[PDB]
Amino acid sequence: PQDLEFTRLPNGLVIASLENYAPASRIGLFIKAGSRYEDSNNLGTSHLLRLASSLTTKGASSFKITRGIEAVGGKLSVTSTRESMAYTVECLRDDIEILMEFLLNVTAAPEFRRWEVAALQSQLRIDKAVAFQNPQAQVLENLHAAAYRNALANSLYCPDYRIGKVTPDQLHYYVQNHFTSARMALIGLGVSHPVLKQVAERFLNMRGGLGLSGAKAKYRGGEIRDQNGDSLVHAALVAESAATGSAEANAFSVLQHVLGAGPHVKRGSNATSSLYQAVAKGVHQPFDVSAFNASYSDSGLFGIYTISQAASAGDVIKSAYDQVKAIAQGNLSNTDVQAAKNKLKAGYLMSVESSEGFLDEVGSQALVAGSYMQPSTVLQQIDSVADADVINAAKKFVSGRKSMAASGNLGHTPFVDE
Amino acid sequence: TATYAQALQSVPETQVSQLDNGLRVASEQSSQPTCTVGVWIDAGSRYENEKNNGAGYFVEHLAFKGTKNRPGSALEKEVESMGAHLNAYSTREHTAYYIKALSKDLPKAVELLADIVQNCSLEDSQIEKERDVILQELQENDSSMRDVVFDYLHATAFQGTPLAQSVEGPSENVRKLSRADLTEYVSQHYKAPRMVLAAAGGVEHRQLLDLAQKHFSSLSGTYVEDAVPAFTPCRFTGSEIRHRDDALPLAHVAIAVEGPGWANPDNVPLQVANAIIGHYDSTYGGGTHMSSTLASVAATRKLCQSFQTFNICYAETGLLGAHFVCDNMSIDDMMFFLQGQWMRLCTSATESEVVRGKNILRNALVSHLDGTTPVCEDIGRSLLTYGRRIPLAEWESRIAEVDASVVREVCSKYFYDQCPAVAGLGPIEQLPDYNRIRSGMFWLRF
Amino acid sequence: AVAASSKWLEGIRKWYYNAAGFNKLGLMRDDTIYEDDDVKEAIRRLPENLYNDRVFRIKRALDLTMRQQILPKEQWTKYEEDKFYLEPYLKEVIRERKEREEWAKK
Amino acid sequence: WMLVADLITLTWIGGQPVEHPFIIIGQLASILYFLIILVLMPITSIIENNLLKW
Amino acid sequence: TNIRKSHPLMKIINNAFIDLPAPSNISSWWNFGSLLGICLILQILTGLFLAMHY
Amino acid sequence: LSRFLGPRYRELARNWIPTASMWGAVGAVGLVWATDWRLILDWVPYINGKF
Amino acid sequence: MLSVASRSGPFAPVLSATSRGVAGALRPLVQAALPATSESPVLDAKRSFLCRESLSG
Amino acid sequence: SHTDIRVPDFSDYRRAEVLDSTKSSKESSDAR
């Protein structure tokens, strides 16, 4: 029942705060830091750090942290996309005052005890092996390493050999540096805004300007095919796409939403996907054909994502790209264009609506654009997108160099070009 | 400024109107631009007898696949057009058809529900899609673990009870049922007041009611031929269930003692116990040597892969219980501690632990109640339960209501000397035989 | 108040340290403390080099107690040559103990 | 070692039939035992816990 | 296929005296306990024949 | 040794007292039953094994 | 609109000290498994399936 | 699989007080 008091500070730190009648008092302190900032020399300082969120602080014993969470009933969680790590804490309105200090104290200067670090090097193995339990995942950290030179090719997680060789010192590096007070941006909610500046300043004084933040990382055409025993290879084909926040990126959005972001009919069907109708007519059912598009602030990666049988994955990926060409022919009914625009609006409304998606959204624009905004303006610019500009984006994906990845059986999954 | 009282009173209440055919309408005015229309039909798996054991799942799998009004591909293309996220599921007892959607499409959405529930067309080829899909899907469900464990738990804890059988039902029953009997299922169950219309959001209540009036007024209320279902206060067997399967990488287990019904005053303090036991999982940095005591030792000696306390409650009866994944050599060990936890809740339950569990509980409520769909569901189930939306001020008055004395009493009345119903899917071998398991329900010291 | 009397106090700290047998063993005062569970974990708090040092020094001392010959006094640990690298770890341990227990009872 | 002296003293008294001078040596022996084990040594170890600054 | 280790009959003894690790530094004093054991065995064999005629 | 002290421990002993006190009574009366203790048997109207 | 959730694809893992370590992003689901052959990964020191954060009574 | 498994009758082994499928077990926990 309000709009937030958007912020800038002389040391720089956004502290947006949507005061509400909502019981779920929450804050989501953010960091612009992520896997991209590291090079080949120190993979995975990131993931061990996200697990290092559990470590003791100068301000508190790890015992006192974990106890300090569970006792109040509140809790914590750590989002960490390549473009941003995202600490988060949730609780009751009269109970935020202490817990907020914890994450502050968490984000302050916890000591990186060597035994504790090697101890979490245990955690790294499990957490990585289970994170990649998904066949889809097997493609994605892979795929980013497929189409990129460095930063965005960085894994979110350290490779297992690196794990023991991951060191507390690298943590000291990435924390002393990339965790800039400027790059960071707190996002309060149920708490009133003005008090949020108060306690935040206990920490907001910490840390000097910026960090390395180099290595933009740029596209490469490189194929990657891990080969596993799975019956269902999940082939994916990607040309680089414009990103992000550009109107052309919006064109990529309209384009993939022509395919659809995902099914809208559980235990049903999805005919409004264009490519899926393009393939299923030509291929037996056990497969999926769907939209995909990376949208990093530095670069994007549009492409087909195609769950498929190893027996005939090629028919699927080809028929799918054939349909993409059909949009790239200039061959486009305008009906599903506006329907796709409606999908843009709908999906954006849901992704905004939930408090998690709300806050992650608010930070996601505030961390980069720096501009808090009501969704409706976004609806206006997104309905502003040109119908033919879709043909434009299709022409680009057909145009750009095509990195491809498809970990799996790799029986009949032909390389891009040859 | 912010305070707990605002958390108390910022929430608007639903109205409870009713149609001529007894369908009731409720929807909190959330002032939400997006809205989730909902109809949580009260029909469910426990109701059907063995002849039509899976019928609800069948209709669950063919609502939109063919409706009498329009071809199913037309309705499909429609929902694909509207951009609304249609959805539906079915518990053992609460079949649910609800459409996440935009407020702008609302009259279209509700009439679309009328197109769904009130009528369905059944192509025999479409029915063939139903059958071949599900028959190919059974084997996939066998591949899953957790469901199969709880499937044994319901299949064994109740046995001869109607509630005991699988929701999807028998592999053979599904490859048999007539289209006509399915229509019979629809025509005996899908009628008001089993349906309960709901859609929290920016939807205007009066418009919702008036909109309901144009469609669901047609809907039947009188039961056919005076045929009338009646129910049982079903017995709870304590029989243990021990499936093994050595080839499976890990033992996978769930224990469950009998619980209070889905309308029982003691359920709230019992919920506190779920927090008090404190569920665990492998990923956490929150375990290590901390967390809850069983979670603590599981994190300390690498006992549990994971375990989850749970408190399912059917309208007659509930199932207090726990569920751990486990390595073969520590099977007994988690158990060795687990039952103690129950006894730990019996004698010497510290109030500090009590408030810990209460706080985690309150957080569980508020965490559940974020979003449109979850609360549309809350409206859509609370009415089937107590009736009422059962307001949070009441829930939290009822959480403040709990005391350690009452905790020890209820725990005494369920944990302290009561016959376990245990189910396992492993391999299990370290796991103690029933008496030994039964041995742990009572401390020899008390 | 106290002044040079304290100088006499570390004076007898020094002389009694000479009186202590482990001084003649070439052993650090850290070396001699009993391995209670606190102390063990404190040892596992240790950086590898201090570990291998305390290890090998205690080993040579034991070898000398086996063959029952004393170290040369020239080779004695001097009262001022010694480090005390177990102490911080120890104080950490006890503080963690008091913390976990006061948290327990409350 | 003084305790050793106290116990050997109890033996030598043990060869000696009950007598007044040995009555005084008697209670002195008992109290000597008590103070030698129950109290003194730990306090000493405290004192060198100070001297070693444990 | 060690006759000692593998064979259970004597394994406890391998757990015991045959191959238990012991500190490099040990005086006669730790030997005294084993002396006490031997003395005990002797007390048995001697008391036994005593009973054989007593 | 001071650890025994504590806010829960007071409440805890308070809780455990009925079960262990009951044992003492049970243990005491049972022990009287086992040694067949005299003077209390004077006080029982029924179980006078004495004439 | 720059949030990754609004543009399905790249993962946004949310590992935590309390709740189960959720991660991943579409890569669209649901209607994939229902068509024939789709085993879904199982038990290799696996973290708990489904996950329950929305408890009631 | 999980579907076709079933619990065969035990009523002949059951106590008479709990022999029927309608009654509360908890009603009979005391007598039993």
Ligand SMILES: CCCCCCCCCCCCCCCCC[C@@H](O)O[C@H](CO[C@H](O)CCCCCCCCCCCCCCC)COP(=O)(O)OCC[N+](C)(C)C
């Ligand atoms: C009850 C109170 C008692 C109080 C006093 C107790 C005293 C205990 C005395 C017993 C302890 C053992 C005595 C120590 C003997 C030293 C070892 C010596 O015997 O040599 C051993 C040799 O022992 C034999 O080889 C053992 C196998 C042969 C046994 C055959 C028995 C031959 C005589 C038996 C006569 C029985 C006649 C019965 C007719 C019916 C090998 O050990 P080792 O010190 O490393 O020697 C290394 C040199 N090597 C290279 C030659 C081996």
